[PDB]
């Protein structure tokens, strides 16, 4: 036990001794706990080995790796102490001196990550938990990110448990050994989206496969609109009939095109929006593409929509012969 400490102390003494002998490595910013009085506080040292590795220039990997195993042997393995860091930064030197002082004081394979669930629907105000399982001991080197409408990811929780500046207070991160949990304390409308974890313990970095979160809602009937081909398009020899179903819930819906009473399936394109971030509804677009010749050979065009909000199919039609 106290053979482990003295070994750590000398390893940290070794680091400090051979660090001092240009002002380029002095720019890196390390962070310390407010109080460091017990063995389980060495978790705070382990948490800074990432940057400590980078400053170590000019296979020192073995040095940091073996420091880490010593810390893991010392800090306890039973439970996951969350470190509380001070806002004030320190050079690599003062950081090393501080932990050395603490030690003297106290003496008296690529990493896989599994995310789950893959998808989830939950109600407003619900507490939601998403999990990531790491193939190895990665400590606090996992972060959580959000992404909406295939746009830029946004950091939510960094270092397993810390809230990023900018992020709603309802997001929080927990860790139990190799199990990581993103928790959303009482789900909000805008929380519809995809969530990813990322191991950034060592190269190569690895993302979780993602979780698709959708909001449950009360039902909502679609607004259905049908549109005949524009005169502009007919001129071009094409004829697209379009049907828009707007702001419906749930997402599960079925649309048939009928031409003069008979279902047409060829030439149809469907598209659905992502869940709306303000109303939690879906919208859908169905386009039936015909040649002008084909289009002008028939009269009645119907878009027939089945949704649970109606006991009979909702129908929208036009006669070509009028317009």
């Amino acid at each position: 036990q106290q053979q482990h400490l003295e070994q750590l102390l000398m390893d940290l003494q070794e680091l400090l001794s051979r660090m001092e002998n240009l002002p380029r490595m002095l720019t890196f910013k390390f962070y310390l706990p407010k109080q460091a009085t017990e063995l389980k506080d060495l978790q705070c040292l382990e948490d800074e080995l990432g940057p400590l590795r980078h400053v170590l220039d000019l296979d020192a990997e073995n040095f940091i790796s073996n420091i880490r195993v010593t810390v893991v042997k010392l800090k306890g393995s039973d439970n996951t102490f969350e470190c509380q860091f001070d806002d004030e930064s320190a050079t690599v030197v003062d950081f090393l001196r501080r932990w050395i002082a603490f030690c003297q004081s106290i003496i008296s394979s690529d990493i896989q990550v599994t995310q789950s669930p893959a998808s989830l629907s939950a109600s407003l105000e619900e507490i939601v938990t998403i999990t990531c399982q790491a193939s190895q001991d990665i400590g606090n080197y996992l972060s959580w990110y959000q992404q909406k409408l295939g746009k830029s990811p946004q950091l939510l929780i960094h270092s397993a448990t810390s809230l990023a500046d900018g992020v709603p207070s309802r997001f929080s991160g927990s860790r139990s050994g190799t199990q990581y949990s993103l928790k959303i304390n009482r789900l909000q409308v805008e929380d519809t989206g995809i969530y990813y974890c990322l191991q950034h313990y060592s190269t190569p970095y690895t993302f979780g496969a993602g979780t698709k979160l959708e909001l449950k809602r009360a039902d909502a009937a679609p607004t259905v609109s049908i549109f005949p081909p524009s005169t502009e398009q007919l001129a071009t020899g094409g004829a697209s009939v379009v049907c828009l179903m707007n702001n419906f819930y749930p997402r599960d819906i079925s649309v048939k095109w009928k031409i003069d009473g008979t279902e047409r399936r060829d030439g149809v394109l469907d598209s659905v929006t992502d869940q709306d971030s303000k109303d939690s509804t879906y919208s859908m677009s169905s386009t039936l593409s015909l040649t002008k010749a084909d289009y002008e050979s028939h009269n009645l065009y119907t878009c027939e929509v089945v949704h649970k909000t109606s006991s009979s199919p909702v129908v929208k039609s036009f006669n070509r012969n009028e317009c």
Binding site: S152, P204, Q233, V242, N246, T287
Partner: protein
């Protein structure tokens, strides 16, 4: 303060290479490790690799060994990713993102992300889209709502940006995901507006396809 900008050919032919760029503003590039991530459509984020502008020291993922090369120039504040021997599996959005130990803890791990840049590997050629108005088949009601739309048919490759009234209409808008059929993309965009706004103000959709340097604005007129 900081922004990252991804830029590169939108269309590339199988077997060629592509060169992406990441322009950093709001701070020097020497303060960041610059990391590249890709996301195939309807898939998740995949880490490509990173480069340290400090020394040009690079790291690569397993699957992009011998596909990817990172390069940099400090004075230009921009980082490069070259991707070789392209196949259809490379068709994806590429983001860049940062790691830093020169600031707070909260800023270390992928705190900043580019908007992302789509790259299509394909043998097809750049096809400008045709824009058509969707206007109501039945006439105006005074005091109600009305839904207008734009068909943007037969373009390649992705993407296209639709707006309404150059940004002034952002609510009531739905731009649907494009659908590929027979080598060409087709998307619709709609907007729901008051019955008053349609007769009094003009309602227009502005569609851009930078890949074909197309710009089309179309006013929606009753029929």
């Amino acid at each position: 303060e900081v922004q990252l900008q991804e830029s590169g050919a939108e269309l590339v032919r199988p077997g060629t290479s592509v060169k992406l760029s990441c322009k950093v503003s709001g701070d020097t590039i020497t303060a960041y490790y610059l990391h590249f991530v890709r996301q195939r459509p309807g898939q998740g984020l995949e880490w490509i690799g990173r480069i340290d502008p400090e020394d040009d020291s690079t790291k690569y993922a397993e699957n992009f060994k011998n596909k990817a090369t990172f390069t940099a120039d400090a004075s230009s504040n921009t980082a490069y990713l070259r991707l070789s021997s392209l196949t259809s599996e490379d068709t994806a959005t590429y983001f860049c993102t940062t790691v830093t130990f020169y600031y707070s803890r909260e800023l270390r791990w992928f705190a900043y992300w580019g908007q992302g840049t789509l790259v299509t590997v394909s043998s097809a050629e750049t096809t400008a889209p045709s824009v058509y108005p969707l206007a109501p088949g039945t006439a105006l009601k005074s005091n109600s709502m009305v839904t207008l739309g734009c068909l943007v048919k037969g373009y390649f490759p992705e993407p296209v940006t639709v707006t309404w009234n150059s940004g002034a209409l952002s609510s009531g808008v739905h731009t649907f995901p494009a659908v590929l059929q027979s080598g060409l993309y087709t998307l619709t965009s709609s907007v729901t507006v008051p019955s008053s706004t349609w007769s009094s103000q003009a309602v227009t959709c502005n569609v851009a396809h930078p890949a074909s340097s197309t710009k089309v604005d179309k006013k929606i007129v009753p029929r």
